[PDB]
Structure 1
């Protein structure tokens, strides 16, 4: 399936099953395929599951412009409009946690039932004047330098810290191959611009505007997006939010802790 964004960008999405809708937002470098196990899980258990490829990623068009959170949220808004979804549970991984939040911030929660933030960059990732505990900006500057040199090798190297393979997590050669294959479909321009986006976007104002049930899951061994200054604070700022911390879990915990995540997601959807 696809739909056309306002600026003319074609976005690829999957729409599986029937019942209450659940809309997934993927992380940096990936596409909708990072959700396949979670989507299959819930759709054969009576839910409708929807995942899209962010502009510049996967099977979607690769525009030069609009590689910003504001546009990402608006893309999501249009997907929901195109499908006429109601009572939507928004699920965001990594940087994809930003755009599900930014959606609610910009469009309200009229159509939203709940929110799930998986190892998300909310509320801030990068360091600010009034947020020194964040990740220094020279880290992300070093990313862009290597991306603009050899992004193929960078993605390949990203696998080890991402999955926590350098810390005794066992991930198959297949998953490593699949991760790199998907990553290479993406736009070099979108890859680099996203760094800027997720590094410097402040979602603290968004945190105040979330007025739906919220589940925050984060690994305490996450080497990419540090729990202490992201997930932990997100659960504090969002009213009535629940937190679950997976012990020793890495960034890419949708792979390593797949069964745990599937059950937590289902439990959340069945609340009260």
Structure 2
């Protein structure tokens, strides 16, 4: 399916099944396909699942402008309005934790029943004056430098630390191939702009506006988004939030810990 955003950007999405809606927001480099197993799992169990390709990624258009969290959040708002969704459970992975949070902050939670943050960059990823524990911005500067030289090889190299293959996790060549194939669909511009967005956007104000049941899941083996300065803190800043830590799990735990995630999502919805 598609809808057209305010600025004319065509956004691809899937809308599967029937029942209370669960809307998924993918991470950097990937697209809606990253959720295929969670969507099938939940939609065969009484839920309606929706997942979009973020502007500049997957099967969506690749605008030069609007590659920032305020726009990402408004895109989600437009999708929700387009489908006229109510009592929706928002689920975000990695940088996608940011735009579902920013959606709530900018638009409120009248249409929202719950929030799930998976290995998310919330409440803040990069260093700030009062957050020296964050990731130094020159780390992300180097991401950009390498992406602007050879993004294809960057993505390929990213697989190892993403899935924790360098630390004993087992992930098939097939999954690594699919990851690279999907990532290559994306815009070079969007890919680099997203680094700026997730490196420097402060979601701490957002946390204070989240007034729905919230579940935070993170792997404490995460090499990409440090548990200690993200997931751990988000769970504290969001009133009433629940926290689940997957022991030694990597960043890409929707793959390595798929069954566990599926069951945790279902249990959250049934609460």
1:225 is the counterpart of 2:225: yes
Aligned to 2:68: 68
What is the number of residues matched between the two proteins?
271
Structure 1 segments of 4+ aligned residues over 4 angstroms from their partners: none
Alignment partner, residue 171 of structure 1: 171
Taking only aligned residues, the RMSD between alpha carbons, in angstroms, comes to 0.2
For residues 12 and 234 of structure 1, what CA distance do their matches in structure 2 show? 29
Structure 2 segments unaligned to the other structure (5+ residues) = none
Query: Once the 2 structures are TM-superposed, how far is the Cα of residue 85 of structure 1 from its aligned partner?
Result: 0.2
Offset at residue 170 of structure 1 (A) = 0.3
Distance in 1, matches of 2:161 and 2:19, equals 37
Question: What displacement does 1:211 show?
Answer: 0.1
Cα deviation digits, residues 133-157 of structure 1 (max 9, x gap): 1000000000000000000000000
CA distances 1:220-264 after superposition (whole Å, capped 9, x unpaired)? 000000000000000000000000000000000000000000000
> What is the TM-score with the length of structure 1 in the denominator?
1.00
Shift of 1:88: 0.3
For 1:213 and 1:124, the matched residues in 2 are separated by 20
Q: What does 1:108-119 correspond to in 2, within 5 Å?
A: 108-119=108-119
Q: Secondary structure at the match of 1:176?
A: helix
SS in 2 for 1:152: helix
Could you say which residue in structure 2 is the equivalent of 1:124? 124
**Aligned residue number for residue 27 of structure 1:** 27
Q: Give distance in 2, aligned partners of 1:168 and 1:205.
A: 37
The CA deviation string for residues 84-143 of structure 1, in whole angstroms up to 9 with x for no partner, is 000000000000000000000000000000000000000000001011110000000000
1:177-230: per-residue Cα shift (whole Å, max 9, x none)?
000000000000000000000000000000000000000000000000000000
Separation in 1 of the partners of 2:106 and 2:143? 29
**Residues 21-57 of structure 1 deviation map (CA, whole Å, 9 limit, x = unaligned):** 0000000000000000000000000000000000000
- For residue 239 of structure 2, give the secondary structure of its aligned residue in structure 1: coil
Q: Where does structure 1 lack aligned partners over 5 or more consecutive residues?
A: none
Q: How does 1:86-235 map to 2 (within 5 A)?
A: 86-235=86-235
Rounded to whole Å, the distance in 2 between the matches of 1:113 and 1:46 is 16
Q: What is the SS of the residue equivalent to 1:184?
A: helix
Q: Secondary structure at the match of 2:185?
A: coil
SS, match of residue 63 in structure 2: coil
CA distance in 1, matches of 2:44, 2:160: 32
- Output the TM-score relative to the length of structure 2: 1.00
Deviation of 1:17 (Å) = 0.2
